[PDB]
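Dear all,

This email documents one entry for the complex benchmark we are building for the journal club exercise. For each entry we list the sequence lines for every component of the assembly. Then comes the predicted three-dimensional structure of the complex as a token string, followed by one or two observations. Please use this as the template for your own entries, and keep the labels exactly as they appear.
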Amino acid sequence: ADGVGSSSGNWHCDSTWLGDRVITTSTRTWALPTYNNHLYKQISNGTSGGATNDNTYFGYSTPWGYFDFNRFHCHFSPRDWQRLINNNWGFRPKRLSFKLFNIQVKEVTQNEGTKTIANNLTSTIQVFTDSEYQLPYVLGSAHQGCLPPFPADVFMIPQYGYLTLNNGSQAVGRSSFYCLEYFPSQMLRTGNNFQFTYTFEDVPFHSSYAHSQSLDRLMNPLIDQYLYYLSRTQTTGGTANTQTLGFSQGGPNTMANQAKNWLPGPCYRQQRVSTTTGQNNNSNFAWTAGTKYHLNGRNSLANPGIAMATHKDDEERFFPSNGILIFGKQNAARDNADYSDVMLTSEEEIKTTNPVATEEYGIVADNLQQQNTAPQIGTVNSQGALPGMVWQNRDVYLQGPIWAKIPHTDGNFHPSPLMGGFGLKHPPPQILIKNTPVPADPPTTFNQSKLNSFITQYSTGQVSVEIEWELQKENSKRWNPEIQYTSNYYKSTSVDFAVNTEGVYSEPRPIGTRYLTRNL
Amino acid sequence: LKHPPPQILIKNTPVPADPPTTFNQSKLNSFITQYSTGQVSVEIEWELQ
Amino acid sequence: LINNNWGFRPKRLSFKLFNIQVKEVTQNEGTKTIANNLTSTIQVFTDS
């Protein structure tokens, strides 16, 4: 029987490995503030200010808040991430559990310059899941406010809000308004708890491997082809060279000429930037030279975009201008952070089947050659899907997003989220939480207007999340040793992935999942 | 002892002070000052020669 | 309702009153404080 004196949950943080499955469990401590003084508010941005047309919006900020566990380091310790990426070809989520317990509602009164805090034992909070997907889904945009990677940190719950259709700063007739109080929710006093379970739909394993072959090198290097290609249009070694047709079989010394069954994946070309600044052009081109898409008269940067190889061989210093994921180091500034303060991801492993982001896709013909007119060619900078293409997705990182909701549409092509992850028609439902308003003392004569005076209040508690993951084991006849993720051997002032003297936990660098290799 | 009596760990659960009303991503560093007390029993059976 | 139906009428209803909090306010000088009174009651009845 639940009561004020009895705890409603226990702390569960563990990882369990069972042959083909691994189960993660995390527990954190959270604090929930009252947002917007219990109000819904219209919020918008328009060109009337200094804002441009590309940045306009219309929407609403709610009094509610929400939980977000959608980053991988929520569920995996750096060591557990190492066990995963060094030994498995692939993995995917299966089911999850969620718990909310040990609720404490507290009240703060402030008189003069002193502040005191006390328990309010009869207050409640409200929690519900949107399991019919009736709200705008804001999870999947890579927002701050998830559970912290380090289990001992206490985190603040982020405020929920959403956008709808706009014209400038104005709203149109199709614009929707939503009230989160119009949903059935559970109310909890300090002795109550909340839980639910969820099952993931069938989804392909994330590929956590790099190819040991390239798409243009699938032939046997010993043997000739029986097919022929056009190798000569003109006679050679003579006083006057003339028109002729010559044919040759493709073989070991001409691999670029052989007939093949497959084509590289699609291309949408990015501008190239060097981390050596002296090599860049002396101009501010980040926005003007950016790779963008146009929608309803409004330009949006295509970021990170489709999965393309970051650079080619021996060109590590180059990266696509808006084509990669970028993470910040601990205590990095919000705006205009230095190169040293950020971490850049690399998609070099997909070079085998995906074109380089800063180069063209290929060459096509432009005209019809004749005796009078020489042939002309043209460069393909953007290429749509062609029959016979194969490609890889973008990699996932320990700091990155796990899933995204697939938009509900008539059609989609290869619905893998472009920031990386698992695309889901029915994603894990979003979880909304709010402090129930407690009025201050009303007047003794009736008044019809809604009360605007309340008791200042906030809540805290613990939350558990448990996810079961399916594993795809590596089965390989490779003779020589593989590449594995490892920590450095040499001495240093601190340990990577630990606290410092101050007690600040930091993450040294981004860690991907591609170490083991497979044949193409 | 290869497997000695296991060590027993205890901690006060942190209770935050009032957070700000606008969201901030950094971990909360303000808490309520707190401590705990209680009683503990230990009983050991000893074999005699 | 109004775009698709010729008519409508009420049938039955349910009423609930819950999560009661009684609070006391004392005011000394110019400061005001509010606290719970856990043993207070309220009275409710229907005139049926």
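Observations: The first strand of chain C starts at residue 23 and ends at 28. Strands of chain C lie at 23-28, 31-36.
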